Amino acid sequence: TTVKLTYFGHSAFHVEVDGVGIAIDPWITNPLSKTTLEDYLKNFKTDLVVITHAHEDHIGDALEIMRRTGAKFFSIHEIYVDLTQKGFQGIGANIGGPAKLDDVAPGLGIALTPATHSSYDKGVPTGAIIFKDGKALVYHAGDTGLFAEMQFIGELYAPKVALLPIGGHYTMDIEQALLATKLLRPEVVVPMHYNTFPPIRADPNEFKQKVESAGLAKVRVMEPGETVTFEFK
Ligand SMILES: [K+]
Ligand SMILES: [Zn+2]
Ligand SMILES: [Zn+2]
């Protein structure tokens, strides 16, 4: 199985997993992006939009993306209610076992995870694990501090690639993201949610050298607009 992973700055990603395009917290137009919304829409196919929580830095350009592409959303129940009432089409879920998304693509599932953070009045914040044929490929942590159930995610699923926030202040710092990496058992970690604004300034290369000197995993510091392909067998 093949995962083509594009980073757009902040916590915005496009995950292509065997010819289905899944966007997560798609603030394409964040301050560090090198991609306009026009560029994104020409260059990526969007089949699903994952929203981890309701902060605007994460919802981002979701609504316009969904209007222009026809893509459905995937999100926690409260956000599903708010967006369904606003006229959008999507799948709602909650924290637990994966949702079966066969209609989107055969064998695809996504589970919502805990996250120690906030989400205005729109339910609770989440992370998201993308499965194919029962295997956890990508865990996008949303915004979060440490959460003890990260250990269960490691043990039960060991998602291959972990997208983890490292900027501090509003989320785990580097130090906490290190412990998280240990708990979650990724093969590779892409750091996110850093440098966009002063309170979240952190050095992703500092993160890298500590995770790797600990032999905890490989860290792929991505650049806004960069794509990287991963195979796991
Ligand atoms: K915004
Ligand atoms: Zn947030
Ligand atoms: Zn955020």
Numbering used by the authors: 2 to 234
From the paper:
Igni18 is an enzyme of the hyperthermophilic Crenarchaeon Ignicoccus hospitalis, one of the most fascinating and enigmatic microorganisms known so far. The characterization of Igni18 conducted in this study unveiled high promiscuity and multi-functionality depending on the availability of different metal ions. Igni18 is highly promiscuous and thermostable and serves as a prototype to study the evolution of the remarkably diverse MβL superfamily.
The overall fold of each monomer is composed of two mixed β-sheets (β14, β1, β2, β3, β4, β5, β6, and β7, β8, β9, β10, β11, β12, β13), slightly twisted and arranged in a parallel fashion in the center of the protein. Those are flanked by four helices on each side of the sheets (α1, α2, α3, α4 and α5, α6, α7, α8), thereby building the four-layered αββα core typical of the MβL superfamily. All interfaces between the three monomers have areas of ~850 Å2 with eleven intermolecular hydrogen bonds. The inductively coupled plasma-mass spectrometry (ICP-MS) analysis conducted to verify the incorporated ion revealed that Zn is preferably bound to the recombinantly produced and purified, non-stripped protein Igni18 with 87.5% mass fraction (data available upon request). However, both methods did not result in binding poses in which cleavable bonds of the ligands approached the zinc ions closer than 7 Å. These results, alongside the fact that soaking the crystals with ligands remained unsuccessful, suggest that the loops surrounding the active center were not crystallized in a conformation receptive for ligand binding.
